[PDB]
Amino acid sequence: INFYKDSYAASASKQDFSQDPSKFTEPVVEGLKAGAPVL
Amino acid sequence: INFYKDSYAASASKQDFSQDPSKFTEPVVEGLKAGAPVL
Amino acid sequence: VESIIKTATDTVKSEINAELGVVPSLNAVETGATSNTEPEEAIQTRTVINQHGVSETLVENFLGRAALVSKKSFEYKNHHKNFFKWTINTKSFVQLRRKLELFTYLRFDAEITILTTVAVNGLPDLTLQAMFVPTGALTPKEQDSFHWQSGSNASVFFKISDPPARMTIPFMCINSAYSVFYDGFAGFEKNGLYGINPADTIGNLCVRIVNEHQPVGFTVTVRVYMKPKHIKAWAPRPPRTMPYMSIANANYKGRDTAPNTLNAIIGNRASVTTMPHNIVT
Amino acid sequence: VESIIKTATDTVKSEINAELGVVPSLNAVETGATSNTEPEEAIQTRTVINQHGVSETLVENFLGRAALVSKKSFEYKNHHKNFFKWTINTKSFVQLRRKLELFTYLRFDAEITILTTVAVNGLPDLTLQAMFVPTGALTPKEQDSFHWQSGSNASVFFKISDPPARMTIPFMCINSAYSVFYDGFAGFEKNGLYGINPADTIGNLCVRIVNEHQPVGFTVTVRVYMKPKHIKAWAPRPPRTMPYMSIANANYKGRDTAPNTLNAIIGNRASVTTMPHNIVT
Amino acid sequence: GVPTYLLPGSGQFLTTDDHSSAPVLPCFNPTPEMHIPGQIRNMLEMIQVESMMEINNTDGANGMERLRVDISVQADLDQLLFNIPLDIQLDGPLRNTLVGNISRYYTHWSGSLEMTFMFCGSFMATGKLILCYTPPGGSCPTTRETAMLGTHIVWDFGLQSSITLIIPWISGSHYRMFNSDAKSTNANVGYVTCFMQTNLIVPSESSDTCSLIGFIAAKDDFSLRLMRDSPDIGQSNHLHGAEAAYQ
Amino acid sequence: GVPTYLLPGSGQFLTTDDHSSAPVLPCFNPTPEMHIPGQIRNMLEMIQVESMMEINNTDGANGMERLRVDISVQADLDQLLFNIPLDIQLDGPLRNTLVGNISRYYTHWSGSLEMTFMFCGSFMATGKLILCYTPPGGSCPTTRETAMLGTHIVWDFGLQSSITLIIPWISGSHYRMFNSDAKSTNANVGYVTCFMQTNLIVPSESSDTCSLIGFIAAKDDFSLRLMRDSPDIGQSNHLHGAEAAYQ
Amino acid sequence: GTHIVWDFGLQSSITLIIPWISGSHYRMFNSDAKSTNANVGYVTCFMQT
Amino acid sequence: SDRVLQLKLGNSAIVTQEAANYCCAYGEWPNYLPDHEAVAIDKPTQPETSTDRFYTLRSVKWESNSTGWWWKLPDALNNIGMFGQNVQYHYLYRSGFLIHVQCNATKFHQGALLVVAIPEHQRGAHDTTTSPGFNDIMKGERGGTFNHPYVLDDGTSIACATIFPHQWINLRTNNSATIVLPWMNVAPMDFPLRHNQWTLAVIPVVPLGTRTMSSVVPITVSIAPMCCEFNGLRHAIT
Amino acid sequence: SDRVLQLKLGNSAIVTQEAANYCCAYGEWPNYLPDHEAVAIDKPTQPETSTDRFYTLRSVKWESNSTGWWWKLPDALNNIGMFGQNVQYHYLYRSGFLIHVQCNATKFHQGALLVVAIPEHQRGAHDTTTSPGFNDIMKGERGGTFNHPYVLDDGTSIACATIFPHQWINLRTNNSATIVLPWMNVAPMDFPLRHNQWTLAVIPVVPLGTRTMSSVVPITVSIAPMCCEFNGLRHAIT
């Protein structure tokens, strides 16, 4: 519980478990299917 | 939460967002319309 | 006219204008009103949802800061003989003074913080007493006079090893607000002081070292900070430009050379067509 | 594509594969995509319910540590004359710097902790003042100048005997995030500094000993730690390999001999068929 | 009792902290509030009032002469009359204004500004001027053909004595900083210039040199951040009477 | 008041603590958030991107030459082409990679790794290679007949230019440690070796020596624990300009 | 100007469209090649690689 | 429509055919003291028409080198008519003020006067640490003159004086300024002989100039107290 | 199917018969500035086809000892066509970029180029504490060359550069690389003459080689700004 009036004073926020690796690992316009030849 | 018995001992009051600039910017008896000639 | 404002106003997109009888960019300064020309009427604008906050400029925050109002050094030794008296005022330190003087009237409670430091002429952990002596009450004459028994006056005892002492003085003016400026005289005769409203008289802050003197002397410095809160302010004023001269008046002289000289507040440039920090590419 | 991940992915059992037209182990690195071959497609796997957590690698935790950002020693005596000024930056200490530089942009609030230590040239329990002087504000010129009255600047007074002072500086960039790297110049002319975004200018941290000097001199050291929190990060980057040379740029030279030499980052082995720590039985 | 532990920061005195504290006078009853004209609740209300720019900040101009710009009947065409440095952090015509003074107690700013000019010549004097705002990037324009390419307003003198030039908020970043480096990309606002659109024309009995008074103010889309001590006031000694307060 | 008592730990400054603390600037309004491409929320996202292994870390190989392994047309059969030390704690081909660099900020690891190799010879060049992963326990294999007994993939050069060798997580314990003793049972991962399955065969006008570029990355079954300072950076003096920040 | 970058390959041919871009509805087959009602512009070909 | 105006109070009236609307200080209007804000318990006297009317002071001449003029309220009226008598016979007073500043010339003259009503205008002295004396402040009906209008004789600035209720008299545009002032103080009533709630300042920011026949160009001030109330009756401090 | 591709913008089009799919940086696509993220209040100009089209820069020659090339955006285009004119006449700009790198050879040639788009690629200088100067950074349409590609001329490494949006041109596989870049900055718009959002780097990780007839093998770059917007109109800083 943050007792200060400014929210930026609060303790850390370690609850954001969202991820999207594909923006780094698969930034290709056409999705690559499992075993289908990529090219 | 103020634990003292006198209210003047409380922490600051930073929640008054009311304003009325017109008392300083337009203290004229007759309201001036947007694009209409002021005089 | 009054309304709740939490963010800067948004901008609405605007189109071309060519209307007879409509001239939003023309105004009449003589009326005393500030121009009401909107950006949307001066140029073609786009729509902008403005999320910029305006809370840091709330008067409560602008003035809500602990500022130095008193600083006093004295010698603690076998004999200011181990104590001092300060006629309270908020006009001795210019940073706080200039800000308070941006307003004509002010109503607020005041949080007072007292910071003490010592130096040998190890450091002793002394006990000090700060007694609030209201107008008309007797002030101490010695480090040990009976006055310090403080039967009714509020006194606070603190050690140099503890955090700074702190307490709140309520809004105590005999009027509904303090007069930051006072265009009048304090008495019924003609020789009274000008510019000092009696109504805003707080009193004296008397501070002593409680401990008897040690075999050696020390220099003790007491700093007092004040932070206004639960603030209400009225009638803003032109900011001070000339350096302050006295705590008792608004007398002025100006710096010897610009900026802020009586003859010229802003520093000079070669001419009205000279651009000072012109970008040279 | 986005989803909530709390544990490492499970493995599903797989069978023998002999399908024409299906070659999961073949890929095309040229597309820029990382191989999507799954363990289940490369070998025969068993089922494994993986309970391994992934919270210790959350960006908030990875960067959420108080790291040294400033260390300054000065002499406290009768005369840096009992105070110093530090133009804030996060590029002086390499451990923190390298981690922050794993990202292109960062948005976070910063918890600041100030640790003070003293040594005689017993130890005095001094009072210090750390004042935050924002860009454009005047910095103190003496241990006792009027600037320290701190009418508007935020100041924190603390004793050497108290726990380290601590406060949080909000995300204060004029943009939506700090630019860890900046491929541009800070001014409209051509002589400006390269690689320094003006937008990320914090200001100066001014620290003084409040006490007047003692009869003898002392060495006082002030260490400042910063811990980012409420973090958002964008566009990860190649980690620094060459030793840092300056706080003002990414200039490089490399170690005199591997590892991390400009000519060879990894240390040499005799040949591409030589196994360095080969198990000899 | 309750098991506790002290955190870093314990015992410190932060001048911007916000906590309740012991009342010195218990049971004190403050004077009843009374309505007073002119209450101000946000400093942004104050900077929206226009105040005079010291445009004629030149050697030879004393006191109030510095607050007005004199324009004369020209012999040549398209003449440059004056320009205004948009410096707020650095000293300049905008520094000692309501918006300038208050803004200097802060470090970051955002929003549109408005400059209003009132022609103070005689009724028989006529003329047309062009006021231009040039977004940053280059050198201040010195010819009307160049200045005219930026934001501007052509002003015709007449019954309505004043004209307003809006300096719209045009910035890449959300805010600009009051940085000591006037040429910084996060501080430079651009320029304002004024040229004759036609010419100041007056009859024999009207004065042939007339004055303009320029005002500036913030619009309600303005916002200020990061409070700091103002560079406009300082002291190197005790003020007269300060020490006497202890006697 | 409330009766309390201080516990051991009171007053300490733990660099990994997590508490709220006094806001320096009350009522400060941070700049509005804006969408920015490439947000990363967990470092595991970064190590799943494959990066180049410095396989040719040998004397005589300078700069980028160290990032590619040259293979030539062989005169003999079943020839060993190269091996890769799977050392992450100790310096080696895997150290300066995304997975290697980030993992070294931790002490424990678990999960499968993937090595992808792209053949960069000419279109007219053909060949078949065998990539093998040998779980720990013995000496690195030096003959194809031995390496072939472990986990492997036979790669045929063709339209699809790259092949992936999965190094499945095969460990007795849940995690392995980045221990300074490379031969420790809680650290050694085994070996990776590459042999000709057939031979590199090219026509007269195609270059007879071709390069391979090897990449490595973690799979999504990966996990890292126990944060520590990385051994990859250090300083023995003040950086240039550090002290000037105080002047 | 208007253009098409052509990569040689399986599909042997490339098409460059010369779109009708004229002020007037029609152009004339006038003997004066530099006339504003006749000149169509130019077509040029350069190596891209 | 907003250029012509007639003000009528008591047996007095004023018209102008060249006004510029008119200012109501802080958007307020004068009013009598309500029971919930009252302090003095004696029944007040509310003379109405005998005091709430226009009093015209002696004129001043606008010269080429004038620095400006000022009149403090209620001091300027403390010895004029029945308002003056009530002020002298009563310890306490309360009132608003309707101010009308007048100045005409020709269509060949130029000049601009800032007409501002300053609350609590505490004057400062120049180049000395000694505070202004009684005679430097209390000028009465004659009013005073500015020594350094550039800093409003108080170390601040006239440039920012527009933050106070005001109007301008720009010869080319108008010939009068009108400002309505409500009671302005931290107390419901006050002793009129030692404190001035408002100071009327008239300063030529743009000097008077012309090339036509020279004539004396006066500036005249007319002030009408509004909603006057007096308490604490006794003998006159005449 | 993912080997052939045609890109068409404005009056320009490009086809390739040997592509390798194409990269959308961070899985994003260019877009105009929405009202809820806007800062500059003047109505922007959106020239569309006159600026959102392919601009082909001068080619470079891939030699046996080449170290690599780089072009900064928008600098490389700040003086080309109508995009260049809008950039010079406006204080602010915003846009995405469609990048197409081209390089063909024969089935007897080998070589591999890393084609990577680096956000905020702040260059470092080699063996000196002096920061890079204006002319070391702003090369314009000609672009620059890498001194030490192994560490990306910034003390890091090309080995890990794959963390940035990229593709490869492996002669044996493809003859072109395509990357779509969205606006990448911490501000909604920026001054185009002093800051480069992206740096296009083309580095030969595997050198060009063959035993067939030697021929000049060029590398060509074509870049199309996307969703261009400009604010803060004035004169040209040509």
Ligand SMILES: CCCCCCCCCC(=O)O
């Ligand atoms: C340190 C005690 C302060 C009590 C309140 C003083 C208010 C003074 C207001 C002023 O006239 O500027």
Ligand SMILES: CCCCCCCCCC(=O)O
């Ligand atoms: C100690 C105060 C720190 C304030 C936040 C500084 C952020 C710097 C980010 C960077 O450019 O690496």
